[PDB]
Paper text:
We carried out the structural analysis of the flagellar hook isolated from Salmonella in the straight form by cryoEM helical image analysis and built an atomic model based on the 4.1 Å resolution map. The hook was purified from a fliK-deficient mutant strain of Salmonella, SJW880, which produces polyhooks that are structurally identical to the native hook but can grow as long as 1 µm. The final resolution of the three-dimensional image reconstruction was 4.1 Å by the criteria of a Fourier shell correlation of 0.143. In the previous model built based on a cryoEM density map, the model of domain D0 was not so accurate and that of domain Dc was missing due to limited resolution of the density map. The model of Salmonella FlgE is now complete with the full-length chain connected from the N- to the C-terminus as shown in Figure 2 in two different views. Domain D0 consists of the N- and C-terminal α-helices (Ser 1–Ala 27 and Leu 367–Arg 402, respectively) forming an antiparallel coiled coil, with the C-terminal helix facing the central channel and tilted from the hook axis by about 17°. Domain Dc is a long β-hairpin (Lys 32–Phe 60) running parallel with the N-terminal helix and with its length nearly the same as that of the N-terminal helix. Thus, domains D0 and Dc together form a compact domain, which we hereafter call domain D0-Dc. In contrast, the Dc domains (green) have close interactions in the −5-start and 11-start helical lines, making a stable tubular structure, albeit the 6-start interactions are absent. Thus, the tubular structure of the hook is stabilized and maintained mainly by the intersubunit interactions of D0-Dc domains alone in the inner core of the hook structure. Residues 38–40 in the middle of the β-hairpin of domain Dc of subunit 0 are closely interacting with the tip loop (residues 328–331) of a short β-hairpin of domain D1 of subunit −5.
Residue numbers in the entry:
A (entry chain A): 1 to 151
B (entry chain A): 303 to 402
C (entry chain A), F (entry chain A): 353 to 402
D (entry chain A): 1 to 101
E (entry chain A): 1 to 51
């Protein structure tokens, strides 16, 4: 009947490592603390058999804001994730406020995934909120002169 | 720019899930949408239930070391208690086997 | 930007904030150290309870 | 499962030395403060495996200007690097305002 | 929870230097005195976070 | 109340009392820490006396 102890032992091991990751990754950015639920196992007896199984969860509470100022250090309050796109056409979510402009004039994390948003159009540009979440880029090319239309 | 103005380049889109809470952990600090999370709802900072996007800041981990160290120590004691349970059973079984 | 003479730029490091960073980091470091010790102790426990 | 602690430990060590270099090199010229990002490692489990990896960055904010007057002490504001060439025909960039004939 | 102290510490440092510049640049011409406002940070708790 | 101009209210925090609060609280905190250690030590004792 060793399973009635071993199960628990293993669950405890898992718990410790979850804690370990919280501690280690306490120096990371946007990281949300992890934890785990546990539940009683197998019936067919008045006595629980096997005994325990673990279910890992993550608690997305807000962090702090950190008096930074380099790059596009955009923090976010409350709920909300930045919508990122992997170069292979895949959508991901993140609270990684660290953004920088790459050599292609694209906003990315590090990671390296593309920050998306709504496209701008017209002159001056307008935001197409109803449009699909296009990759945000920032051209370094010139504003064309625009004739007076009215005055 | 030099032409004496500000122009819109784009709008950062924010996403909320039904559950936020349910996302599949990946990479660096990346989450994949899941059925548990439901489908992401898109919006902008300050609209609906989408928080604000102040610049000048990083969020930083929400882990509190003053409580994690405690958790760890307690867990270690619990762990050992389980270890004794096993040893207990082992000793017993060995006893049985050899009393014959 | 401009190239005024008569000056050197000098490092942008702010010691009033770096010392703080360091102290905090040291505590964090030790927290990790305990995590390892914890696991080690445990493993040793297991090994010897047999 | 020591890796889930060791990884972090190592990351912390790196962080400390990055800070150490900022402190030491605070007396240098044109030096831009360094830092590092960190990210969660390995899936295949509800629990992060390995745990942490570091990515070093450098924040090029402007420094100060320092009331000097010898040589060709040319400071630079905002963005811009001086274009330098190594005697072996190689191009480099620097904000090292100290120049001499 | 060091951030709840560090934030403030940094703010204080800034304040001091603002004052320092007012003092130093008191000998300049047309210079207008500088100062700074401060505000409370992060919710999600009864206790201010960051600060 | 009245709205006189020419003034800002400024925080009502009194540092002469907050520093005191802090020091006392730290001692209290440590007392709790010993309570935990006490229990831990004890449990370890029990486990190993067998």
């Amino acid at each position: 009947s060793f399973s009635q102890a071993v199960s628990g032992l293993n669950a405890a091991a898992t718990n410790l490592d979850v804690i370990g990751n919280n501690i280690a990754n306490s120096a990371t950015y946007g990281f949300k603390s992890g934890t785990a639920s546990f539940a009683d196992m197998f019936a067919g007896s008045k006595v629980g058999l096997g005994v325990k199984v673990a279910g890992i969860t993550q608690d997305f509470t807000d962090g702090t804001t950190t008096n930074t100022g380099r790059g596009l250090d955009v923090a976010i309050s409350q709920n909300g994730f930045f919508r990122l796109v992997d170069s292979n056409g895949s959508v991901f979510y993140s609270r990684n406020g660290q953004f920088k402009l790459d050599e292609n004039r694209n906003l990315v994390n590090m990671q390296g995934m593309q920050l998306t948003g709504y496209p701008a159009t017209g002159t001056p540009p307008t935001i197409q909120q109803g449009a699909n979440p296009a990759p945000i880029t920032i051209p370094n090319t010139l504003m064309a002169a625009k004739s007076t239309t009215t005055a | 720019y030099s032409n004496e103005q500000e122009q819109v380049l784009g709008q950062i889109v924010l996403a909320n899930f039904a559950n936020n809470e349910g996302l599949a952990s990946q990479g660096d600090n990346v989450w994949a949408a899941t059925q548990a999370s439901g489908v992401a709802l898109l919006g902008t900072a300050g609209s609906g239930n989408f928080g604000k996007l102040t610049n000048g800041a990083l969020e930083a981990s929400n882990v509190d070391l003053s409580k994690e160290l405690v958790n760890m120590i307690v867990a270690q004691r619990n762990y050992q208690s389980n270890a004794q349970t096993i040893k207990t059973q082992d000793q017993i079984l060995n006893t049985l086997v050899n009393l014959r």
